[PDB]
Design a protein around this ligand. Sequence first.
Ligand SMILES: *[C@@](C)(CO)[C@](*)(O)[C@H](Cc1ccccc1)NC(=O)[C@H](Cc1ccc(OC)cc1)NC(=O)[C@@H](C)NC(=O)CN1CCOCC1
Ligand SMILES: [Mg+2]
Lengths: 244, 240, 233, 231, 250, 222, 235, 211
Amino acid sequence: GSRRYDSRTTIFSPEGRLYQVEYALESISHAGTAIGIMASDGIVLAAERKVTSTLLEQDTSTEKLYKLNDKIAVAVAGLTADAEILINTARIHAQNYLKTYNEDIPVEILVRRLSDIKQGYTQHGGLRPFGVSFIYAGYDDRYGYQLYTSNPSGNYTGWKAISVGANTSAAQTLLQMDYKDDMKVDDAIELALKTLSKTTDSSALTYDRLEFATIRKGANDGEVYQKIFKPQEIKDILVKTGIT
Amino acid sequence: GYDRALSIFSPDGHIFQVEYALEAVKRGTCAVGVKGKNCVVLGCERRSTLKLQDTRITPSKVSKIDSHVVLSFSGLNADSRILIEKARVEAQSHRLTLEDPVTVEYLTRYVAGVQQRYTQSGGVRPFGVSTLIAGFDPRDDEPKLYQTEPSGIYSSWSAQTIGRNSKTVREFLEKNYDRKEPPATVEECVKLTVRSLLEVVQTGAKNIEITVVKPDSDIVALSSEEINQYVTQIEQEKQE
Amino acid sequence: TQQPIVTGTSVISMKYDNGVIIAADNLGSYGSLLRFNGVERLIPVGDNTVVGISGDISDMQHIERLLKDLVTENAYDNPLADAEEALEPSYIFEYLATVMYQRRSKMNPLWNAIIVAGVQSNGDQFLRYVNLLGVTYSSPTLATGFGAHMANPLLRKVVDRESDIPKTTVQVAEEAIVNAMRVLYYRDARSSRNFSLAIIDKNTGLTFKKNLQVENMKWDFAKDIKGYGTQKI
Amino acid sequence: NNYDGDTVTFSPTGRLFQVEYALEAIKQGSVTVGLRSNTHAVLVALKRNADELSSYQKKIIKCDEHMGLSLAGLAPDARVLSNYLRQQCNYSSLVFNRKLAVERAGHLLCDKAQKNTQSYGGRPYGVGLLIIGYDKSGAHLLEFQPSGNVTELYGTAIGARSQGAKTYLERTLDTFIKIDGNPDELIKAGVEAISQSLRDESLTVDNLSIAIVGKDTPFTIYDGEAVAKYI
Amino acid sequence: MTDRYSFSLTTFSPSGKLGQIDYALTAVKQGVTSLGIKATNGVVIATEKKSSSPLAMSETLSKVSLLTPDIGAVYSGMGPDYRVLVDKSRKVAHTSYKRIYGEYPPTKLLVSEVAKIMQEATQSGGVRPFGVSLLIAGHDEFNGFSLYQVDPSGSYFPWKATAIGKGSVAAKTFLEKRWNDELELEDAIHIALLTLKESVEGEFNGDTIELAIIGDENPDLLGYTGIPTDKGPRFRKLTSQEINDRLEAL
Amino acid sequence: QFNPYGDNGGTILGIAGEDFAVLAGDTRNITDYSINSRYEPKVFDCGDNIVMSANGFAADGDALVKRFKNSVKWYHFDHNDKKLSINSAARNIQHLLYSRRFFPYYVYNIIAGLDEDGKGAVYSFDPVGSYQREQCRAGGAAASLIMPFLDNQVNFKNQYEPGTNGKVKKPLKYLSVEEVIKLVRDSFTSATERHIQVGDGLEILIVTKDGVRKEFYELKRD
Amino acid sequence: DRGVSTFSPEGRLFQVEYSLEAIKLGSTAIGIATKEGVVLGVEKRATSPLLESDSIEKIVEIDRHIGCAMSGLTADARSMIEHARTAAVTHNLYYDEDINVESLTQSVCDLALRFGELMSRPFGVALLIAGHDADDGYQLFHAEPSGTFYRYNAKAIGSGSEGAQAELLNEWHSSLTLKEAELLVLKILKQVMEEKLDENNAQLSCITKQDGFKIYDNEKTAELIKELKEKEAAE
Amino acid sequence: TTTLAFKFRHGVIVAADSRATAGAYIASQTVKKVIEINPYLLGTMAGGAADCSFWERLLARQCRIYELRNKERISVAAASKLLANMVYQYKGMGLSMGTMICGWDKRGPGLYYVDSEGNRISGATFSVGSGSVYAYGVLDSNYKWDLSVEDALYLGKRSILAAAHRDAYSGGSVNLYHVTEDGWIYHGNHDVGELFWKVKEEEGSFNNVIG
Ligand SMILES: *[C@@](C)(CO)[C@](*)(O)[C@H](Cc1ccccc1)NC(=O)[C@H](Cc1ccc(OC)cc1)NC(=O)[C@@H](C)NC(=O)CN1CCOCC1
Ligand SMILES: [Mg+2]
């Protein structure tokens, strides 16, 4: 019968690893590098688009940075199509929470929910896991600014600074070196771009090969603003930090 | 629905998927449980390969199931969340239907039953998780410490460890822990739990987590400095 | 739950020494309208059973089809279908009785009153009643609807108890049935002159009589009846 | 070889190996004998024990007042099939006030076993049954194979070393068929038949199991000191 | 019976590759060339009508399809897969949008819905990925004109101009030299015909080429008058004659 | 509107002796003012020395008896031909009845037989399963006519010993089967006189350790 | 791969035969039936000295008149015990009586072969079901994952089973007392166990008509062990 | 019916009449309205005879499984709650039950009122049934915590009698129970006919009645 053709996506190896999760992580390691850095007065999200073309319409393009709600955003590394499935689920979850409790969803709760969905695909159903790793950048009134990551295993952890995708080993070393606790957003912006500039597989880091975003309390009085950077705004910040 | 039998017997009478789930536990960070005369302490390893971590928001290794019971684990982190959620739901369901909080033995039996169910259900793989469940029964001053594992077997322990290099710390506990006279105070119990982790951990900085549970829903997690004082005193006595 | 539309009136029957007799008129009424005049309400099953049905005709036709299908199904993989493993009156009745009670228990009844008349393998007379409620009973005489009120009293004068059955011949029993049908034609407003009669004998087998008529009727005395009390002319 | 992984697969020569392997489980099972006359039908079964401390596994199961069977192979599968027969015999009584014909009981078993040989996921039944009964056409004996094949016979035997008893019945055919109105003599012929399949061991009091049904005899099972008469 | 293939047929290999998606992309590579170019006041999509037999009436086979009045689609790869995707795309435009908001979806959101359908065929049980790459051109009020590519994985990218299929590598190079941000629609059609001639072997005329545009509103194609706000479809398929007229000025 | 229930009349009576039990019932079946049958059995031998009668709506009564007889059959299959005790049968019948709590069997049920000590036993049920063991019980149409008579002549209620004047009761001396059958016949003869649904015939089933015996007596047919 | 309900060429279900191998690896459990009662005893086999041995529950009550010992993958037994307890109590609800030991055992064994592609595999545990009823008296059954159950006068399951069964072959007779049976279980357990038998690593239990099913205290068992040592040293 | 139960220093008394009614007709006069859940638990029956009997026996089976699973006797609070949740499923469906779950557990003597309407109430004194209103008068006026077992049994018996006399749908006989920490003890069946006259003479009460 059908058993003959079943790959068995949800099994342990003799060493106690989940084959498909490990292979999904191998896929993600070839994806464009995404970096998240958390500061005292905000969060930075930086990400590299993969070998683009001159004929790609950049200003209407979105492959890395997505908005979940007004307070929370995500950077993607892996299969974009898979990520959009999860992103729409997360957007719905955030709205369900808001309808139920009349309060914006705490960041961790949203992260846990998505991570639980990913976990399910590794334990039951016989389906391949989502080949996606997220960096969650968000704010709530309990813990303030928060950075999380989740991977196809459904495991999630909190970070001060973190990278996913390609060259994370090199990128994490550079972040661990120059990061300090009393750091500010403007400094974190510079660190993120410098790290990408050194870890990139491309010849040079340009505006057309980047997606960038910040979450700042730099909004008029006690409130939070999400800024998805436009192509011209990425070009300006590259000149300001002295990369181009 | 996906019905495929993943956990099955082999010619030599082994269920490999359940045994490979134990290998996932062996890979997991070390967890230790020690019960004193009037308390139980849960110690947990934090691997220092991950720095730049935000320790405020990172999921803690010890989880409260109810106000009087806690659960720590070794193995796959994502798998543990599913067991903990189920355990927490059952704990409230028990209070709701029977008007008493769960006993530690009952909660352990439930969690172990879930783990077992995933070893002979179609389309699912076993949990790659072993748990240490500790606490005090309602209106009782006797300490309780149980262990579970992927196969679904569970048992009570005077002291026990699970995870990577658990063989070494179990060796330490077997010679150091005396049943006739267990750690009389909280200090003695915590000290013995830290000592046991220092056989394996590496550095005694942010790699050791300690959680003390006392009777009548008195649960507290020690801080870095409080633990560091234990690490200091242990090694100063060792230099002799 | 429904209401009966096209209906059939009384079915009457009785036991005699060697078998059973059953009869029913050929009318299908539509309320007070005597709509259909050629309706057969006695339905033979094999050569040993006749099922007489009163009540809703659409449900009767449904039952008729179930019985026809029952014969077909019994013949399947059955070399003794026309012998030892042929359908018995008791088998046919219990099947219907099962169906009737199940249907009432779903609040969707077959709006009928049924009498299964026949002769068993061992020569024993079979005569049992079942209706829309699933209520069953047996008696030396059985009748449905108006027949219960008018025919039974007349038929019970012939066979009052079990011991009167061997003393009753087929000629006497048929005479009583035919007389009862005449009485029902006098007094039942939803009856017709035309009727069918069936005899199931253990020796002579199944005799099915169609196109019978009520005859020897008394009407002459009507000419003398004038007015409603005081009128003389 | 490559075509024996499941029941849904024919071999290149048109064989169903899983069904043949299920047939093999019957041959490993303990011997049981069936035979009949015109008035009665008899089952004789050699029960098997695990060891000297253990009991002797029951081989005969009652299905109705007028019908029952003996088993050889996987006992749990016999429990499932006998339970099905019990329900079918019972459906016939409750609905039609009719005792189920033995021939029709065989047709139902055939059809139930067949569904397990043509579908994926399931498995064939691993048991052989000998059904006896008395209905409106007299005494009957049936042999059930889990391939689905059901056969009406005067006498037969299934299980280990069953060929010896089957040969005996083939010689005795003309004699035991005529044993009418004599239950004890018909059982004697059955006990003598099953004796042709014995090696080393002999028929003891807790070893032998007998059942009978007939004209004025409900299906009854005899065990223990009740069969000492026939030893 | 029952569909017992409840498990994924597309899975990660040790190298991290999703084999069936790669193989689907290989099928797209073998497919006939199709392209899309975005102008300032319109979009053009084009492809070759590769007729399987001269006895076959190639007019009955439509490679370029209307999805909504302001959105069109063309493909490269497996034709039957494309046909069913068009049926689903047309339906989802109504069920998930028009029946809710009372208007047709914007290009990017319809593309998003099509992409979702193709992603699900890449993860759901007992199915293979679609063996097509789509080029979807469209217009809506707030986003203006747009052109999107959709791959077997479900990934989609917005393009100024692009090509897919047989001679896509050469065609994309050709488009890079000719494309600018000041192109009028007629200029884009001209460039589309030049680009497409390079990949075609045999006959090159209005009967062997299929070409459609997203441009100005066509009130003559609306089918009714009386409602000022309804001005007609922006999608228009060019006729055989209209193509041949532009091949003389080529 | 369709009424799924009916009333087939009839009356039943169960009396328990020291080492026997009787279950009696008239043989008349009726609807409204008509007679369906003058002899339609209402009390049945269900096996294992248990007799049963479900009085009220005949279609429901026949179904319940049919189910209980079936329950006895499967009790033998499932428990090695073990004998179903009267107390076990009663509990089983409760569950048959309550399984239709929201569409009841419209019957009053009585069973009779012997308990495990060999003494006479009668169990009485309501339509939804409440049962209890009794020494004396009449059920059905004329139950209210008969029960007061049995309270007086079986349990000696309101009867005292002469001379004492209400100070000392009449002692509870057991009854024989012959004395019981007299009370049964007089009960039904009296009921037949004053109740229109009672008459035609009387069939009594007597249960002893030896088995189940029957006795039939004619009644007035008016 | 291959079906879960597949027959081998010899006519055996692969999975059932493989589950029997798992039971051979399990700790020893012994049952002895007498006319004064049935005795059940088990090897606890703690994996470490820190493991509180009294929490090892390999002997279990099903009803007041039925007990149960297990051997093999003991986690698999929990749902079987649960079903057994439910069956026993449910029968008491429907029939106002105790349930027959055979009927209870049959109910447990009906679960056994409910596996396929229902649960995904057979049970990896064997059960010794001991009890008493009025019809057949004191009984001992051995319930396997094949769905088969044999009644026994005495039976041993687990790692030291064939060695223990041979010993039970010689020692059992129809006139055994309860006290004699208790010592006999302790004797054979001590013989097949790896570690030295004491009150902490072995557990006794019995079922009598009067007192019902009882698990023995460690103080009570300790005395029976001391009584055993002295009687073996007596000759 | 009339049923009552009350807690006191020495446990809990449970009393009930024995009349069963079918309109004006007295169907039975020997009915057990007290249910034996387990040796330390009792249940009363008022309203639907079949309903009370069936659900409480179902409760009893539920309680026994509890003991097997948990190696421990169920509490009165948990037992009453299982019943309450069981009947709550069938709320509005026509069930008619008025019950009291009486027992002794780790918290001492326990008494819960549970009905088909959904109420579940812990209390020291309860009386349910058509005659409850008559019984409450005697209870409330004579009830103390420091009551002897002898006096307590009489109070519960006398309270039923008061109701049996006045209420037409209450009577027959009185069944008494006493629940201790060592289990429940049955204190006999008392015919109201004989009991009434006895109490009248000894107590002097019921002066208006002639005897
Ligand atoms: C008093 C007597 C009535 O208010 C009390 O509530 C008793 C309680 C009771 C408890 C257990 C067993 C018997 C009685 N209730 C009744 O007697 C009820 C009152 C009642 C009548 C009608 C109802 O339908 C709406 C509901 C309640 N009577 C019954 O339940 C009656 C229908 N059944 C029985 O009497 C059962 N007996 C009758 C004789 O055969 C044996 C069973
Ligand atoms: Mg009368």
